[PDB]
Write a protein that binds this ligand. Structure first.
Ligand code: ALF
Length: 71
DNA sequence: TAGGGAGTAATCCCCTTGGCGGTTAAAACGCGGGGGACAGCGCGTACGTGCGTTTAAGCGGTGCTAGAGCTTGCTACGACCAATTGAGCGGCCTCGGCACCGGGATTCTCCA
């Protein structure tokens, strides 16, 4: 039941990672420096709202600061 | 020895292209007929050809002097730059010019 944050230094890898995560059955969401600011609010609030999501795919720099991911 | 350039990838703002939907106005399609394209014809006059005349353009020659083209000397003036500011650009505001509409009046066409 360990909801989990994955940090990447490369954007192409977090693409490949969700190809793997969609080959498996893992429910995931994504935040990186290309996501637009309202999309960032929504994904952060989505992951922090509903326990259904398993993996937060998460960029090191854009996702590394300021936000709360305490769930 | 160190500073700043080379490499690279993430981050995030700007902006041009493309699609969806409607809807609506302009392009496409039809067809009658008219009148303008155009061929065919007559004349006449106006332009090309030819011949004799003249006129003056072009070539060979002489003489002159203006002025283009070059050298010299110097100082005036525009390039140059450091210090100063105010003219002119970028952003923001608003109101009045002008357009667009509607309906009543005058003009222009075309057929009788
Ligand atoms: F210091 Al933080 F999010 F960790 F502002």
């Amino acid at each position: 039941g360990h909801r989990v944050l994955l940090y990447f230094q490369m954007t192409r890898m977090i693409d490949l990672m969700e190809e793997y995560l969609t080959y498996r059955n893992y429910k995931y969401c994504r935040l990186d420096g290309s996501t637009k600011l309202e999309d960032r609010r929504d994904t952060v609030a989505d992951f922090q709202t509903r326990p259904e999501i398993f993996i937060f795919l998460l960029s090191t720099r854009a996702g590394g600061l300021g936000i709360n991911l305490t769930t």
